[PDB]
Design an enzyme around this catalytic site. Structure first.
Site, PDB file in Angstrom:
ATOM      1  N   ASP A   1      -1.790   1.477  -3.852  1.00 45.26           N
ATOM      2  CA  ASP A   1      -2.699   0.608  -4.555  1.00 45.26           C
ATOM      3  C   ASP A   1      -4.108   1.130  -4.889  1.00 45.26           C
ATOM      4  O   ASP A   1      -4.994   0.435  -5.399  1.00 45.26           O
ATOM      5  CB  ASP A   1      -2.691  -0.705  -3.752  1.00 45.26           C
TER       6      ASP A   1
ATOM      7  N   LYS B   1     -11.557  -0.801  -0.138  1.00 42.07           N
ATOM      8  CA  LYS B   1     -11.844   0.622  -0.271  1.00 42.07           C
ATOM      9  C   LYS B   1     -11.472   1.011  -1.731  1.00 42.07           C
ATOM     10  O   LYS B   1     -10.733   0.331  -2.466  1.00 42.07           O
ATOM     11  CB  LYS B   1     -11.027   1.404   0.765  1.00 42.07           C
TER      12      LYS B   1
ATOM     13  N   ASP C   1      -3.109   6.553  -2.845  1.00 45.79           N
ATOM     14  CA  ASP C   1      -1.962   5.805  -2.356  1.00 45.79           C
ATOM     15  C   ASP C   1      -1.431   4.767  -3.370  1.00 45.79           C
ATOM     16  O   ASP C   1      -1.941   4.633  -4.490  1.00 45.79           O
ATOM     17  CB  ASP C   1      -2.385   5.145  -1.039  1.00 45.79           C
TER      18      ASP C   1
ATOM     19  N   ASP D   1      -6.677   2.376  -2.916  1.00 44.40           N
ATOM     20  CA  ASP D   1      -7.866   2.282  -2.107  1.00 44.40           C
ATOM     21  C   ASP D   1      -8.084   3.381  -1.060  1.00 44.40           C
ATOM     22  O   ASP D   1      -9.112   3.495  -0.374  1.00 44.40           O
ATOM     23  CB  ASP D   1      -7.831   0.868  -1.610  1.00 44.40           C
ATOM     24  N   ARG D   2      -7.172   4.348  -1.057  1.00 43.06           N
ATOM     25  CA  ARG D   2      -7.270   5.505  -0.185  1.00 43.06           C
ATOM     26  C   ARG D   2      -7.117   6.798  -0.979  1.00 43.06           C
ATOM     27  O   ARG D   2      -6.517   6.891  -2.061  1.00 43.06           O
ATOM     28  CB  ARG D   2      -6.212   5.458   0.949  1.00 43.06           C
TER      29      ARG D   2
ATOM     30  N   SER E   1       0.824  -1.211   0.000  1.00 44.24           N
ATOM     31  CA  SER E   1       0.000   0.000   0.000  1.00 44.24           C
ATOM     32  C   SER E   1       0.859   1.262   0.000  1.00 44.24           C
ATOM     33  O   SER E   1       1.706   1.342  -0.902  1.00 44.24           O
ATOM     34  CB  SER E   1      -1.038  -0.033   1.217  1.00 44.24           C
ATOM     35  N   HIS E   2       0.811   2.244   0.897  1.00 43.01           N
ATOM     36  CA  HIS E   2       1.638   3.442   0.935  1.00 43.01           C
ATOM     37  C   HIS E   2       3.103   3.206   1.365  1.00 43.01           C
ATOM     38  O   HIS E   2       3.950   4.103   1.392  1.00 43.01           O
ATOM     39  CB  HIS E   2       0.969   4.455   1.885  1.00 43.01           C
TER      40      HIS E   2
HETATM   41 NI    NI Z   1      -3.891   1.248   0.063  1.00 41.44          NI
END
Ligand code: NI
Length: 561
Positions: free
Chosen positions: A289, A388, A287, A291-292, A116-117
Protein backbone atom coordinates in the site's frame (compact mmCIF):
# COMPACT_ATOMS: atom_id res chain seq x y z
CA UNK A 1 -32.51 2.46 -6.31
CA UNK A 2 -34.25 0.42 -3.55
CA UNK A 3 -33.28 -0.01 0.12
CA UNK A 4 -33.42 -3.57 1.37
CA UNK A 5 -32.80 -4.82 4.99
CA UNK A 6 -31.02 -8.18 5.21
CA UNK A 7 -31.33 -10.42 8.28
CA UNK A 8 -27.85 -11.62 9.21
CA UNK A 9 -26.25 -14.00 11.75
CA UNK A 10 -23.32 -12.45 13.68
CA UNK A 11 -19.63 -13.53 13.74
CA UNK A 12 -17.22 -14.12 16.73
CA UNK A 13 -13.80 -13.50 15.13
CA UNK A 14 -14.19 -10.00 13.62
CA UNK A 15 -11.83 -8.15 15.91
CA UNK A 16 -10.08 -5.29 14.10
CA UNK A 17 -6.36 -4.94 14.77
CA UNK A 18 -4.26 -1.72 14.54
CA UNK A 19 -4.20 -2.21 10.82
CA UNK A 20 -7.92 -3.07 10.68
CA UNK A 21 -9.38 -6.53 10.06
CA UNK A 22 -7.24 -9.06 8.05
CA UNK A 23 -8.33 -12.52 7.06
CA UNK A 24 -7.46 -14.63 4.03
CA UNK A 25 -9.56 -13.88 0.81
CA UNK A 26 -11.27 -17.28 1.25
CA UNK A 27 -12.93 -16.31 4.59
CA UNK A 28 -14.42 -13.21 2.95
CA UNK A 29 -15.73 -14.97 -0.18
CA UNK A 30 -16.94 -18.20 1.56
CA UNK A 31 -18.31 -17.09 4.93
CA UNK A 32 -21.77 -15.73 4.18
CA UNK A 33 -22.14 -12.10 5.00
CA UNK A 34 -18.63 -11.81 6.58
CA UNK A 35 -17.74 -8.65 4.58
CA UNK A 36 -21.28 -7.16 4.64
CA UNK A 37 -21.40 -7.64 8.45
CA UNK A 38 -18.08 -5.93 9.02
CA UNK A 39 -18.79 -3.01 6.56
CA UNK A 40 -22.22 -2.30 8.14
CA UNK A 41 -20.46 -2.41 11.56
CA UNK A 42 -17.87 0.26 10.39
CA UNK A 43 -20.75 2.49 9.07
CA UNK A 44 -22.73 1.93 12.27
CA UNK A 45 -20.03 3.68 14.37
CA UNK A 46 -21.09 6.87 12.49
CA UNK A 47 -24.22 8.09 14.29
CA UNK A 48 -27.38 8.88 12.18
CA UNK A 49 -27.43 12.71 12.41
CA UNK A 50 -23.98 12.85 10.83
CA UNK A 51 -24.54 10.50 7.82
CA UNK A 52 -26.18 12.92 5.28
CA UNK A 53 -23.31 15.42 5.41
CA UNK A 54 -20.60 12.73 5.69
CA UNK A 55 -18.12 11.92 3.00
CA UNK A 56 -16.10 8.74 3.24
CA UNK A 57 -13.03 8.09 1.07
CA UNK A 58 -12.70 4.50 -0.29
CA UNK A 59 -9.74 2.85 -2.00
CA UNK A 60 -7.12 0.06 -1.86
CA UNK A 61 -3.84 -1.51 -3.01
CA UNK A 62 -5.52 -3.26 -5.89
CA UNK A 63 -5.15 -6.89 -4.73
CA UNK A 64 -7.78 -9.54 -5.80
CA UNK A 65 -11.35 -9.10 -4.26
CA UNK A 66 -10.91 -5.28 -3.87
CA UNK A 67 -13.48 -4.43 -6.55
CA UNK A 68 -16.16 -6.78 -5.11
CA UNK A 69 -15.71 -5.36 -1.57
CA UNK A 70 -15.81 -1.64 -2.87
CA UNK A 71 -19.13 -2.41 -4.61
CA UNK A 72 -20.34 -3.77 -1.19
CA UNK A 73 -19.15 -0.57 0.59
CA UNK A 74 -21.09 1.55 -1.95
CA UNK A 75 -24.42 -0.34 -1.51
CA UNK A 76 -24.28 -0.44 2.30
CA UNK A 77 -22.97 3.21 2.68
CA UNK A 78 -25.76 4.27 0.26
CA UNK A 79 -28.64 2.37 2.02
CA UNK A 80 -27.29 3.51 5.38
CA UNK A 81 -27.68 7.24 4.78
CA UNK A 82 -24.07 8.28 3.88
CA UNK A 83 -24.41 11.28 1.50
CA UNK A 84 -21.13 10.92 -0.41
CA UNK A 85 -18.29 8.57 -1.31
CA UNK A 86 -15.03 9.78 -2.96
CA UNK A 87 -13.55 6.70 -4.63
CA UNK A 88 -10.14 6.69 -6.30
CA UNK A 89 -10.21 5.79 -10.00
CA UNK A 90 -10.49 2.00 -10.54
CA UNK A 91 -10.75 1.65 -6.76
CA UNK A 92 -6.96 2.44 -6.68
CA UNK A 93 -5.76 4.74 -3.97
CA UNK A 94 -2.53 4.26 -1.90
CA UNK A 95 -2.61 4.44 2.01
CA UNK A 96 -0.68 7.80 1.95
CA UNK A 97 -3.14 9.07 -0.77
CA UNK A 98 -6.30 8.08 1.27
CA UNK A 99 -4.84 9.83 4.41
CA UNK A 100 -4.07 12.90 2.20
CA UNK A 101 -7.59 13.11 0.69
CA UNK A 102 -9.46 12.65 4.08
CA UNK A 103 -7.63 15.67 5.47
CA UNK A 104 -7.81 17.67 2.17
CA UNK A 105 -11.59 17.48 1.66
CA UNK A 106 -12.38 17.14 5.44
CA UNK A 107 -13.98 13.66 5.20
CA UNK A 108 -15.45 11.78 8.27
CA UNK A 109 -12.85 9.09 7.66
CA UNK A 110 -12.16 6.42 5.08
CA UNK A 111 -12.09 2.72 4.29
CA UNK A 112 -8.80 1.41 2.99
CA UNK A 113 -8.84 -2.07 1.36
CA UNK A 114 -5.27 -3.43 1.85
CA UNK A 115 -3.35 -6.27 3.80
CA UNK A 116 -0.11 -4.20 3.28
CA UNK A 117 2.86 -6.58 2.33
CA UNK A 118 0.70 -9.66 2.98
CA UNK A 119 0.14 -11.52 -0.28
CA UNK A 120 -2.70 -11.14 -2.68
CA UNK A 121 -4.80 -13.23 -4.98
CA UNK A 122 -7.29 -16.14 -4.72
CA UNK A 123 -5.25 -17.90 -2.01
CA UNK A 124 -3.89 -14.79 -0.23
CA UNK A 125 -4.95 -12.20 2.31
CA UNK A 126 -7.47 -9.39 2.40
CA UNK A 127 -7.85 -6.56 4.88
CA UNK A 128 -10.30 -3.77 5.66
CA UNK A 129 -8.60 -0.88 7.48
CA UNK A 130 -10.75 2.03 8.86
CA UNK A 131 -9.14 5.48 9.20
CA UNK A 132 -10.71 8.48 11.02
CA UNK A 133 -11.14 12.27 10.16
CA UNK A 134 -7.55 13.23 11.15
CA UNK A 135 -6.48 10.91 8.27
CA UNK A 136 -4.87 8.30 10.58
CA UNK A 137 -5.96 4.73 11.62
CA UNK A 138 -9.01 4.45 13.96
CA UNK A 139 -7.97 4.37 17.66
CA UNK A 140 -8.67 1.45 20.12
CA UNK A 141 -11.89 3.09 21.40
CA UNK A 142 -13.29 2.93 17.85
CA UNK A 143 -11.83 -0.49 16.78
CA UNK A 144 -13.31 -2.19 19.88
CA UNK A 145 -16.73 -0.46 19.33
CA UNK A 146 -16.77 -1.93 15.74
CA UNK A 147 -15.88 -5.27 17.40
CA UNK A 148 -18.73 -4.96 19.91
CA UNK A 149 -21.19 -4.41 17.02
CA UNK A 150 -19.89 -7.23 14.71
CA UNK A 151 -20.40 -9.92 17.45
CA UNK A 152 -24.01 -8.91 18.17
CA UNK A 153 -25.32 -7.78 14.74
CA UNK A 154 -28.68 -9.27 13.52
CA UNK A 155 -29.40 -7.16 10.33
CA UNK A 156 -27.73 -4.86 7.73
CA UNK A 157 -29.19 -2.34 5.24
CA UNK A 158 -28.30 -2.54 1.53
CA UNK A 159 -29.18 -1.19 -2.01
CA UNK A 160 -28.70 -4.51 -3.96
CA UNK A 161 -29.45 -3.05 -7.34
CA UNK A 162 -27.01 -0.10 -7.16
CA UNK A 163 -23.73 -0.34 -9.13
CA UNK A 164 -21.14 2.29 -10.14
CA UNK A 165 -18.51 2.36 -12.87
CA UNK A 166 -15.16 2.68 -11.09
CA UNK A 167 -13.25 3.58 -14.28
CA UNK A 168 -15.14 6.74 -15.21
CA UNK A 169 -14.06 10.06 -13.63
CA UNK A 170 -16.62 12.52 -12.20
CA UNK A 171 -19.90 12.55 -10.35
CA UNK A 172 -22.54 9.86 -10.29
CA UNK A 173 -25.79 10.59 -8.54
CA UNK A 174 -28.39 8.06 -7.47
CA UNK A 175 -31.88 8.35 -5.94
CA UNK A 176 -32.78 6.01 -3.09
CA UNK A 177 -36.42 4.90 -2.33
CA UNK A 178 -38.34 7.71 -0.59
CA UNK A 179 -35.12 9.57 0.51
CA UNK A 180 -35.11 13.33 -0.27
CA UNK A 181 -31.33 13.77 -0.89
CA UNK A 182 -29.55 11.76 -3.67
CA UNK A 183 -26.52 9.52 -3.04
CA UNK A 184 -23.30 10.88 -4.61
CA UNK A 185 -20.31 8.80 -5.72
CA UNK A 186 -17.32 10.85 -6.95
CA UNK A 187 -14.57 9.13 -8.97
CA UNK A 188 -11.36 11.02 -8.50
CA UNK A 189 -8.01 10.53 -10.38
CA UNK A 190 -5.86 8.30 -8.11
CA UNK A 191 -2.74 10.49 -8.22
CA UNK A 192 -3.83 14.16 -8.56
CA UNK A 193 -4.61 15.34 -4.93
CA UNK A 194 -1.55 13.42 -3.66
CA UNK A 195 0.85 14.89 -6.29
CA UNK A 196 -0.64 18.37 -5.59
CA UNK A 197 0.27 18.01 -1.88
CA UNK A 198 3.78 16.78 -2.77
CA UNK A 199 4.20 19.67 -5.28
CA UNK A 200 3.99 22.08 -2.26
CA UNK A 201 6.16 19.96 0.11
CA UNK A 202 9.14 19.52 -2.26
CA UNK A 203 10.86 21.55 -4.99
CA UNK A 204 9.78 19.71 -8.16
CA UNK A 205 12.02 22.04 -10.24
CA UNK A 206 15.31 20.97 -8.51
CA UNK A 207 14.10 17.41 -8.88
CA UNK A 208 13.15 17.92 -12.62
CA UNK A 209 16.78 19.12 -13.12
CA UNK A 210 18.14 16.13 -11.15
CA UNK A 211 16.22 13.44 -13.10
CA UNK A 212 16.21 14.94 -16.61
CA UNK A 213 19.31 17.29 -16.79
CA UNK A 214 22.87 16.52 -18.23
CA UNK A 215 23.97 15.02 -14.91
CA UNK A 216 20.86 12.85 -14.72
CA UNK A 217 20.57 10.69 -11.64
CA UNK A 218 19.90 7.17 -12.89
CA UNK A 219 17.23 5.66 -10.66
CA UNK A 220 15.38 2.34 -10.45
CA UNK A 221 12.08 2.39 -8.58
CA UNK A 222 10.36 -0.94 -7.92
CA UNK A 223 6.72 -0.71 -6.97
CA UNK A 224 6.47 -4.54 -6.59
CA UNK A 225 3.16 -4.57 -8.59
CA UNK A 226 1.36 -2.81 -5.75
CA UNK A 227 -0.56 0.45 -5.52
CA UNK A 228 2.33 2.98 -5.84
CA UNK A 229 3.02 2.07 -9.53
CA UNK A 230 0.53 4.69 -11.00
CA UNK A 231 2.10 7.23 -8.62
CA UNK A 232 5.69 6.48 -9.72
CA UNK A 233 4.73 6.87 -13.38
CA UNK A 234 2.75 10.11 -13.24
CA UNK A 235 4.92 11.85 -10.56
CA UNK A 236 8.48 10.60 -11.24
CA UNK A 237 8.31 9.86 -14.97
CA UNK A 238 5.58 12.14 -16.53
CA UNK A 239 6.09 15.15 -14.23
CA UNK A 240 9.70 14.99 -13.01
CA UNK A 241 11.05 13.58 -16.29
CA UNK A 242 12.68 10.33 -15.18
CA UNK A 243 12.93 8.02 -18.31
CA UNK A 244 10.12 5.42 -18.66
CA UNK A 245 12.51 2.59 -17.78
CA UNK A 246 13.10 4.02 -14.28
CA UNK A 247 9.73 2.57 -13.24
CA UNK A 248 9.93 -1.21 -12.81
CA UNK A 249 6.86 -3.23 -11.62
CA UNK A 250 4.56 -0.17 -11.80
CA UNK A 251 1.29 -1.72 -13.02
CA UNK A 252 -1.02 -2.85 -10.08
CA UNK A 253 -1.55 -6.63 -10.40
CA UNK A 254 -4.25 -8.55 -8.41
CA UNK A 255 -1.82 -11.16 -7.01
CA UNK A 256 1.21 -8.79 -6.88
CA UNK A 257 2.73 -11.12 -9.50
CA UNK A 258 2.48 -14.14 -7.13
CA UNK A 259 5.36 -12.80 -5.00
CA UNK A 260 4.93 -10.77 -1.70
CA UNK A 261 5.24 -6.90 -1.96
CA UNK A 262 7.63 -6.68 0.94
CA UNK A 263 10.32 -4.03 0.73
CA UNK A 264 13.44 -5.81 2.01
CA UNK A 265 16.72 -7.49 0.86
CA UNK A 266 15.04 -10.92 0.53
CA UNK A 267 11.77 -9.99 -1.29
CA UNK A 268 13.16 -7.07 -3.33
CA UNK A 269 16.03 -9.35 -4.47
CA UNK A 270 15.43 -8.74 -8.24
CA UNK A 271 15.96 -4.98 -7.66
CA UNK A 272 19.03 -5.67 -5.35
CA UNK A 273 20.72 -7.65 -8.16
CA UNK A 274 19.80 -4.93 -10.79
CA UNK A 275 21.39 -2.43 -8.39
CA UNK A 276 24.58 -4.52 -7.88
CA UNK A 277 25.55 -3.86 -11.55
CA UNK A 278 26.58 -0.22 -10.89
CA UNK A 279 24.54 1.41 -13.73
CA UNK A 280 22.04 2.99 -11.33
CA UNK A 281 22.79 5.74 -8.81
CA UNK A 282 19.77 5.09 -6.68
CA UNK A 283 17.24 2.28 -6.27
CA UNK A 284 14.13 1.93 -4.13
CA UNK A 285 11.26 -0.49 -3.36
CA UNK A 286 7.80 -0.04 -1.73
CA UNK A 287 5.17 -2.36 -0.16
CA UNK A 288 1.55 -3.27 -1.13
CA UNK A 289 0.00 0.00 0.00
CA UNK A 290 2.88 2.46 -0.30
CA UNK A 291 3.64 3.38 3.29
CA UNK A 292 6.95 1.56 3.63
CA UNK A 293 10.21 1.80 1.72
CA UNK A 294 13.68 0.40 1.08
CA UNK A 295 16.55 2.70 -0.08
CA UNK A 296 19.50 1.55 -2.20
CA UNK A 297 22.69 3.31 -3.32
CA UNK A 298 25.06 2.46 -6.23
CA UNK A 299 26.24 -1.26 -6.54
CA UNK A 300 23.51 -2.56 -4.15
CA UNK A 301 24.56 -0.30 -1.15
CA UNK A 302 21.85 -0.98 1.43
CA UNK A 303 20.86 2.10 3.36
CA UNK A 304 19.51 0.69 6.65
CA UNK A 305 15.96 2.02 7.62
CA UNK A 306 17.35 3.31 10.95
CA UNK A 307 20.18 5.24 9.19
CA UNK A 308 17.71 6.58 6.60
CA UNK A 309 15.50 8.56 9.11
CA UNK A 310 18.78 9.87 10.61
CA UNK A 311 20.13 11.15 7.21
CA UNK A 312 16.81 12.90 6.30
CA UNK A 313 16.94 14.38 9.89
CA UNK A 314 20.50 15.65 9.45
CA UNK A 315 19.49 17.47 6.21
CA UNK A 316 15.78 18.17 6.85
CA UNK A 317 16.10 21.86 5.86
CA UNK A 318 16.88 20.89 2.25
CA UNK A 319 13.12 20.23 1.98
CA UNK A 320 10.91 23.41 1.43
CA UNK A 321 8.18 22.10 3.79
CA UNK A 322 10.59 22.03 6.81
CA UNK A 323 11.98 25.42 5.95
CA UNK A 324 8.52 27.03 6.06
CA UNK A 325 7.07 24.95 8.89
CA UNK A 326 9.99 24.24 11.25
CA UNK A 327 10.79 20.88 12.98
CA UNK A 328 8.50 20.24 16.06
CA UNK A 329 10.33 17.04 17.08
CA UNK A 330 11.95 13.75 16.07
CA UNK A 331 10.76 10.20 16.92
CA UNK A 332 11.47 6.57 16.58
CA UNK A 333 10.29 3.22 17.88
CA UNK A 334 12.50 1.74 20.73
CA UNK A 335 13.79 -1.29 18.67
CA UNK A 336 15.04 1.20 16.03
CA UNK A 337 18.75 2.22 16.21
CA UNK A 338 20.33 5.15 18.00
CA UNK A 339 21.38 7.03 14.80
CA UNK A 340 18.41 9.46 14.99
CA UNK A 341 19.37 10.23 18.62
CA UNK A 342 22.89 11.36 17.67
CA UNK A 343 21.36 13.84 15.09
CA UNK A 344 18.58 14.93 17.56
CA UNK A 345 21.21 15.61 20.32
CA UNK A 346 23.09 18.06 18.06
CA UNK A 347 20.00 20.34 18.22
CA UNK A 348 17.52 21.71 20.81
CA UNK A 349 14.87 19.46 19.15
CA UNK A 350 13.05 16.82 21.23
CA UNK A 351 13.41 13.09 20.55
CA UNK A 352 10.72 10.59 21.52
CA UNK A 353 11.28 6.86 21.89
CA UNK A 354 8.03 5.10 21.35
CA UNK A 355 6.92 1.45 21.19
CA UNK A 356 6.01 -0.24 17.91
CA UNK A 357 3.06 1.05 15.86
CA UNK A 358 1.81 4.24 14.19
CA UNK A 359 -0.63 5.28 17.01
CA UNK A 360 2.31 6.59 19.01
CA UNK A 361 3.65 8.66 16.11
CA UNK A 362 0.16 9.90 15.17
CA UNK A 363 -0.66 11.12 18.69
CA UNK A 364 2.53 13.22 18.99
CA UNK A 365 1.98 14.63 15.47
CA UNK A 366 -1.60 15.66 16.38
CA UNK A 367 -0.20 17.23 19.59
CA UNK A 368 2.14 19.29 17.31
CA UNK A 369 5.20 17.70 18.80
CA UNK A 370 6.45 15.63 15.84
CA UNK A 371 7.74 16.41 12.36
CA UNK A 372 9.87 13.46 11.30
CA UNK A 373 9.52 9.81 12.44
CA UNK A 374 11.17 6.51 11.49
CA UNK A 375 11.13 2.77 12.28
CA UNK A 376 13.66 -0.03 11.59
CA UNK A 377 10.95 -1.95 9.69
CA UNK A 378 11.30 0.14 6.46
CA UNK A 379 9.08 2.93 7.77
CA UNK A 380 9.53 6.66 7.42
CA UNK A 381 7.07 9.50 7.88
CA UNK A 382 6.35 13.13 8.55
CA UNK A 383 3.41 15.19 9.75
CA UNK A 384 2.25 16.07 6.23
CA UNK A 385 -0.36 13.23 6.54
CA UNK A 386 -1.28 10.73 9.34
CA UNK A 387 0.21 7.53 7.86
CA UNK A 388 3.70 6.46 6.82
CA UNK A 389 4.58 7.48 3.26
CA UNK A 390 6.97 5.43 1.13
CA UNK A 391 7.13 7.78 -1.94
CA UNK A 392 7.58 10.89 0.31
CA UNK A 393 10.78 9.22 1.75
CA UNK A 394 12.13 8.68 -1.84
CA UNK A 395 11.55 12.34 -2.86
CA UNK A 396 13.07 13.45 0.49
CA UNK A 397 16.23 11.40 -0.46
CA UNK A 398 16.27 12.72 -4.11
CA UNK A 399 15.96 16.30 -2.66
CA UNK A 400 19.00 15.57 -0.43
CA UNK A 401 20.96 14.15 -3.44
CA UNK A 402 19.91 17.24 -5.50
CA UNK A 403 21.11 19.68 -2.78
CA UNK A 404 24.24 17.72 -1.84
CA UNK A 405 25.40 16.55 -5.27
CA UNK A 406 27.06 13.53 -3.61
CA UNK A 407 26.41 9.77 -3.98
CA UNK A 408 24.27 7.79 -1.44
CA UNK A 409 27.50 5.99 -0.40
CA UNK A 410 29.19 9.34 0.28
CA UNK A 411 26.21 10.92 2.11
CA UNK A 412 26.27 8.06 4.65
CA UNK A 413 30.12 8.06 5.05
CA UNK A 414 30.10 11.84 5.73
CA UNK A 415 27.10 11.23 8.07
CA UNK A 416 28.88 8.44 10.06
CA UNK A 417 32.06 10.59 10.36
CA UNK A 418 30.03 13.44 11.86
CA UNK A 419 27.56 11.59 14.07
CA UNK A 420 29.49 8.32 14.51
CA UNK A 421 27.91 4.99 13.38
CA UNK A 422 25.14 2.87 14.90
CA UNK A 423 25.78 -0.64 13.54
CA UNK A 424 22.30 -2.12 13.45
CA UNK A 425 21.00 -5.56 12.65
CA UNK A 426 17.76 -7.45 13.24
CA UNK A 427 17.36 -11.15 13.83
CA UNK A 428 13.98 -12.77 13.23
CA UNK A 429 13.29 -16.20 14.85
CA UNK A 430 9.80 -16.91 13.45
CA UNK A 431 7.44 -19.15 15.45
CA UNK A 432 8.85 -21.07 18.45
CA UNK A 433 7.52 -22.94 21.55
CA UNK A 434 6.06 -20.40 23.97
CA UNK A 435 7.11 -21.94 27.38
CA UNK A 436 10.85 -21.91 26.60
CA UNK A 437 10.58 -18.36 25.15
CA UNK A 438 8.73 -17.03 28.25
CA UNK A 439 11.41 -18.68 30.43
CA UNK A 440 14.19 -17.09 28.32
CA UNK A 441 12.38 -13.75 28.91
CA UNK A 442 11.53 -14.30 32.66
CA UNK A 443 14.96 -15.64 33.76
CA UNK A 444 16.51 -12.77 31.72
CA UNK A 445 14.23 -10.20 33.46
CA UNK A 446 15.25 -11.56 36.88
CA UNK A 447 18.93 -11.48 35.92
CA UNK A 448 18.54 -7.91 34.52
CA UNK A 449 16.83 -6.45 37.60
CA UNK A 450 19.75 -7.39 39.98
CA UNK A 451 21.88 -5.16 42.24
CA UNK A 452 25.11 -6.37 40.56
CA UNK A 453 23.60 -6.46 37.05
CA UNK A 454 23.88 -2.68 36.63
CA UNK A 455 27.43 -1.17 36.09
CA UNK A 456 29.02 -4.61 35.42
CA UNK A 457 31.49 -5.60 32.75
CA UNK A 458 30.50 -7.92 29.87
CA UNK A 459 33.22 -8.47 27.15
CA UNK A 460 34.37 -10.30 24.02
CA UNK A 461 37.01 -9.37 21.37
CA UNK A 462 37.00 -5.58 20.27
CA UNK A 463 34.94 -4.06 23.11
CA UNK A 464 34.15 -3.83 26.81
CA UNK A 465 30.40 -3.76 27.51
CA UNK A 466 29.26 -2.25 30.85
CA UNK A 467 25.51 -2.62 31.76
CA UNK A 468 24.30 1.03 32.31
CA UNK A 469 20.54 0.12 32.28
CA UNK A 470 18.32 -3.01 31.83
CA UNK A 471 14.51 -3.38 31.70
CA UNK A 472 11.23 -4.34 30.10
CA UNK A 473 10.28 -1.15 28.20
CA UNK A 474 7.06 0.59 28.99
CA UNK A 475 5.42 3.67 27.61
CA UNK A 476 2.95 6.19 28.96
CA UNK A 477 1.42 7.96 25.97
CA UNK A 478 1.24 11.75 26.64
CA UNK A 479 -1.84 12.30 24.47
CA UNK A 480 -4.43 9.49 24.88
CA UNK A 481 -3.30 8.53 28.38
CA UNK A 482 -2.57 4.87 27.54
CA UNK A 483 0.12 2.80 29.11
CA UNK A 484 1.81 0.10 27.04
CA UNK A 485 3.61 -2.23 29.39
CA UNK A 486 6.32 -4.82 28.74
CA UNK A 487 7.04 -3.73 25.18
CA UNK A 488 10.52 -5.25 25.09
CA UNK A 489 13.53 -6.53 26.91
CA UNK A 490 16.30 -4.02 26.87
CA UNK A 491 20.01 -4.37 27.60
CA UNK A 492 21.74 -0.97 27.57
CA UNK A 493 25.54 -0.77 27.72
CA UNK A 494 27.46 2.43 28.70
CA UNK A 495 29.18 3.07 25.33
CA UNK A 496 25.90 3.39 23.47
CA UNK A 497 25.36 -0.29 22.51
CA UNK A 498 22.06 -2.02 23.06
CA UNK A 499 20.41 -5.46 22.69
CA UNK A 500 16.60 -5.75 22.43
CA UNK A 501 14.46 -8.84 22.77
CA UNK A 502 10.88 -8.70 21.57
CA UNK A 503 8.47 -11.59 21.75
CA UNK A 504 5.71 -11.29 19.16
CA UNK A 505 3.84 -14.56 19.97
CA UNK A 506 0.54 -16.26 18.98
CA UNK A 507 -2.28 -17.94 20.99
CA UNK A 508 -3.07 -19.65 17.70
CA UNK A 509 0.19 -21.32 16.53
CA UNK A 510 3.38 -20.57 18.53
CA UNK A 511 5.69 -17.54 19.21
CA UNK A 512 8.13 -15.16 17.33
CA UNK A 513 11.45 -14.03 18.82
CA UNK A 514 12.88 -10.71 17.51
CA UNK A 515 16.47 -9.85 18.33
CA UNK A 516 17.58 -6.28 17.51
CA UNK A 517 21.28 -5.27 17.99
CA UNK A 518 22.34 -1.60 17.93
CA UNK A 519 26.08 -1.05 18.57
CA UNK A 520 27.58 2.37 18.63
CA UNK A 521 30.91 3.24 17.13
CA UNK A 522 32.75 6.52 16.96
CA UNK A 523 36.17 5.50 15.60
CA UNK A 524 36.96 6.93 12.22
CA UNK A 525 38.69 3.71 11.14
CA UNK A 526 36.30 1.00 12.42
CA UNK A 527 33.18 2.89 11.16
CA UNK A 528 33.28 1.42 7.62
CA UNK A 529 33.96 -2.27 8.31
CA UNK A 530 31.11 -4.78 7.92
CA UNK A 531 28.17 -4.83 10.34
CA UNK A 532 28.14 -8.65 10.88
CA UNK A 533 31.87 -8.55 11.78
CA UNK A 534 31.54 -5.44 14.07
CA UNK A 535 28.30 -6.64 15.72
CA UNK A 536 29.50 -10.26 16.34
CA UNK A 537 30.58 -9.74 20.08
CA UNK A 538 27.10 -8.39 21.03
CA UNK A 539 25.22 -11.09 18.99
CA UNK A 540 27.20 -13.82 20.81
CA UNK A 541 26.65 -12.03 24.20
CA UNK A 542 22.85 -11.85 23.38
CA UNK A 543 22.72 -15.62 22.80
CA UNK A 544 24.97 -16.28 25.88
CA UNK A 545 22.73 -14.12 28.21
CA UNK A 546 19.36 -15.09 26.70
CA UNK A 547 20.49 -18.71 26.40
CA UNK A 548 18.24 -18.89 23.29
CA UNK A 549 20.22 -21.81 21.80
CA UNK A 550 19.72 -23.56 25.20
CA UNK A 551 15.95 -23.05 25.90
CA UNK A 552 14.88 -23.04 22.19
CA UNK A 553 17.71 -25.00 20.46
CA UNK A 554 17.94 -22.66 17.41
CA UNK A 555 21.50 -21.64 16.36
CA UNK A 556 20.93 -19.34 13.39
CA UNK A 557 18.17 -16.71 12.78
CA UNK A 558 15.30 -17.18 10.28
CA UNK A 559 15.72 -13.68 8.76
CA UNK A 560 18.52 -11.10 8.97
CA UNK A 561 17.73 -7.40 8.31
NI1 NI B 1 2.15 -0.92 4.21
Amino acid sequence: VKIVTVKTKAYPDQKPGTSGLRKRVKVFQSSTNYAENFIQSIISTVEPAQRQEATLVVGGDGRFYMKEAIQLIVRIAAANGIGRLVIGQNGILSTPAVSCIIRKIKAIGGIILTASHNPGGPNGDFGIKFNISNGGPAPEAITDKIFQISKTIEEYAICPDLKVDLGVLGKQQFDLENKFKPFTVEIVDSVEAYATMLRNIFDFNALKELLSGPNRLKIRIDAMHGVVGPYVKKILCEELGAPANSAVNCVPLEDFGGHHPDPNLTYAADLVETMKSGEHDFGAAFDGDGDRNMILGKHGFFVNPSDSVAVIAANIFSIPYFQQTGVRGFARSMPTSGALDRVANATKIALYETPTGWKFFGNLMDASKLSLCGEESFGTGSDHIREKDGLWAVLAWLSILATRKQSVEDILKDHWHKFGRNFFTRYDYEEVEAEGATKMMKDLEALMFDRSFVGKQFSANDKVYTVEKADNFEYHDPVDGSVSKNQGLRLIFADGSRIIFRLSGTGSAGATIRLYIDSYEKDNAKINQDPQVMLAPLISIALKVSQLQERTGRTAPTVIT
